Amino acid sequence: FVNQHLCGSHLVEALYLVCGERGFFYTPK
Amino acid sequence: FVNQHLCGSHLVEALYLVCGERGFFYTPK
Amino acid sequence: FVNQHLCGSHLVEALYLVCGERGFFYTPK
Amino acid sequence: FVNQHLCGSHLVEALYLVCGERGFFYTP
Amino acid sequence: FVNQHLCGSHLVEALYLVCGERGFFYTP
Amino acid sequence: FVNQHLCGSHLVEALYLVCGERGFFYTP
Amino acid sequence: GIVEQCCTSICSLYQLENYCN
Amino acid sequence: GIVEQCCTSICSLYQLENYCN
Amino acid sequence: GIVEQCCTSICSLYQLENYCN
Amino acid sequence: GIVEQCCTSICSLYQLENYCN
Amino acid sequence: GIVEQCCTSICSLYQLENYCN
Amino acid sequence: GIVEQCCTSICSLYQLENYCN
Ligand SMILES: *C(=O)CC[C@H](NC(=O)CCCCCCCCCCCCCCC(=O)O)C(=O)O
Ligand SMILES: *C(=O)CC[C@H](NC(=O)CCCCCCCCCCCCCCC(=O)O)C(=O)O
Ligand SMILES: Oc1cccc(O)c1
Ligand SMILES: Oc1cccc(O)c1
Ligand SMILES: Oc1cccc(O)c1
Ligand SMILES: Oc1cccc(O)c1
Ligand SMILES: Oc1cccc(O)c1
Ligand SMILES: Oc1cccc(O)c1
Ligand code: NA
Ligand code: NA
Ligand SMILES: [Zn+2]
Ligand SMILES: [Zn+2]
Structure with a gap:
């Protein structure tokens, strides 16, 4: 999992x- | 602003x- | 300065x- | 691979x- | 090996x- | 202070x- | 939002949990 | 998801922008 | 130079692309 | 040390804290 | 303190090396 | 180049001076 x-x-x-100013969601996965 | x-x-x-596994939302507003 | x-x-x-794979020249001058 | x-x-x-003084040239 | x-x-x-303000030693 | x-x-x-291999202490 | 809350005064890792999913 | 796509092969800025809000 | 320009006002990735090889 | 432990398997925040003063 | 010395002025790699073990 | 020279084995900061202007 480290890599x-x-x-x-x-x-x-x-x-x-x-x-940028839109941002984002980060959703593993 | 740049800062x-x-x-x-x-x-x-x-x-x-x-x-972690939850992830996050980046919402600068 | 440090900023x-x-x-x-x-x-x-x-x-x-x-x-990306093109790369770039960087100078502060 | 993305490595x-x-x-x-x-x-x-x-x-x-x-x-620092003069920067660099990055050419992969 | 670079990883x-x-x-x-x-x-x-x-x-x-x-x-945080506790600090740490880094020692490979 | 964030900065x-x-x-x-x-x-x-x-x-x-x-x-490098010597490592360091980080002490704020 | 996180920029207002955390770009002048430091947000602890515990405070930053407020922006996890 | 994004890790599977973009850690398998490099995602372009266009490809990354699909994951923005 | 570029640091003064882009550390005084934000430079977008579009703006920076013209500095690529 | 921390590299053998945490570059072979992901160390959690709590596991990293093991290495603070 | 490194923070006082090197966030108040730019420290060279040579100056930073003083803080190594 | 730098990728063949420094993404397989560790380049020291001295070795990296090869890529300064
Ligand atoms: C959006 O445009 C920002 C607008 C602004 N709204 C707010 O600032 C409210 C944001 C939502 C969270 C408020 C929750 C209040 C409870 C405070 C908890 C403090 C506990 C301390 C620990 C910690 O920091 O987590 C508006 O226009 O109204
Ligand atoms: C979290 O993503 C769960 C997703 C999971 N699997 C995948 O998405 C597919 C496998 C990912 C390939 C990883 C390759 C990454 C190479 C990283 C280089 C390692 C060394 C990096 C050194 C450096 O920091 O530069 C799933 O279950 O779908
Ligand atoms: O308040 C902050 C701002 C940026 C990073 C961080 O860990 C905390
Ligand atoms: O495919 C990827 C993975 C990580 C960073 C990036 O710019 C692209
Ligand atoms: O204008 C800037 C300055 C620093 C980083 C960046 O992405 C843009
Ligand atoms: O195990 C690791 C290795 C590197 C960063 C990290 O947060 C955990
Ligand atoms: O003075 C400084 C502060 C932070 C990083 C660095 O290389 C130098
Ligand atoms: O060999 C390398 C590769 C990347 C960063 C570095 O400091 C050395
Ligand atoms: Na970034
Ligand atoms: Na707001
Ligand atoms: Zn990395
Ligand atoms: Zn920074």
């Missing part, structure tokens, strides 16, 4: 930048 | 960690 | 995200 | 710190 | 958040 | 990169 955990960390930071 | 943009990146990281 | 320094770290993360 | 994409993010952060 | 190095980066950031 | 809190996250990551 997936680390990938998810990167993913939510990218989604933060893409979505 | 809030920078704050949000750190907030998302913290929510990812705190919320 | 700028830490903001710049986020800025290069955003450049990395948008540029 | 190299994720590694690049770490590379740029380190380059930002190492190459 | 321990990269994982360690994530781990210290998590420790920073969890330990 | 200090956020600065500390970056300090611990820079220490991780600089201190």
Whole structure:
């Protein structure tokens, strides 16, 4: 599970930048 | 403001960690 | 000062995200 | 695999710190 | 092998958040 | 103060990169 | 919302739970 | 979900934007 | 330079794309 | 140490707290 | 304190290395 | 390049100076 955990960390930071003031939900999964 | 943009990146990281399998919503308003 | 320094770290993360496999040149000049 | 994409993010952060005065050129 | 190095980066950031003003030693 | 809190996250990551195998103490 | 609540004064990890699903 | 898609192969910014509100 | 520009006012990912190789 | 433990399996918040002062 | 010294002014990697073990 | 050189094995900060301008 560690690899997936680390990938998810990167993913939510990218989604933060893409979505901006719209925000987003992160829902594992 | 840029400060809030920078704050949000750190907030998302913290929510990812705190919320675990539940996930989270990032709603900056 | 320190503000700028830490903001710049986020800025290069955003450049990395948008540029992907293309990469980018970064200068503060 | 996505491994190299994720590694690049770490590379740029380190380059930002190492190459303070003049920046860096990231070419994967 | 880079994955321990990269994982360690994530781990210290998590420790920073969890330990707060208590601090921590990081010791591989 | 949030500015200090956020600065500390970056300090611990820079220490991780600089201190390498030696590790570090983070003491606010 | 989380920016108003947490971008001036530090939100503890316990307070941040308010924004979990 | 997003982890399965985007940890299998790289998601473009367009692909990520599908997960925004 | 770019840090002054983008640390004074927010730069979008669209704006940053023109700095890619 | 913390790397052998927490880079082989995900350490929870509580498990990480084991390593605080 | 590292926070006082390095959030009030930019610390070089050489200055940060002082805080290593 | 940097990915072949530094995403397989750990590059030290000295090694990373190869990619400064
Ligand atoms: C939206 O546009 C913001 C508008 C604003 N509404 C609020 O600020 C209310 C937000 C909902 C949560 C309020 C719950 C109040 C209970 C306070 C609990 C304090 C306990 C301390 C521990 C902790 O911080 O969790 C508006 O326009 O009205
Ligand atoms: C949580 O996502 C549950 C989802 C789960 N499985 C999947 O979504 C599919 C498997 C994910 C592939 C993970 C590969 C990630 C590679 C990460 C690189 C590891 C090293 C990273 C080092 C670094 O930080 O850069 C399901 O049950 O569907
Ligand atoms: O109040 C905050 C703001 C950003 C990150 C965090 O952990 C707490
Ligand atoms: O597919 C992914 C995974 C993580 C970050 C990202 O920008 C894309
Ligand atoms: O304007 C900026 C500054 C820093 C990061 C970013 O995504 C945008
Ligand atoms: O086990 C781990 C490794 C890295 C970050 C984390 O939150 C937990
Ligand atoms: O002065 C600082 C503060 C935070 C990170 C860093 O590399 C330098
Ligand atoms: O070899 C690497 C890869 C990524 C970051 C780093 O500091 C070193
Ligand atoms: Na981010
Ligand atoms: Na509001
Ligand atoms: Zn990573
Ligand atoms: Zn930051």
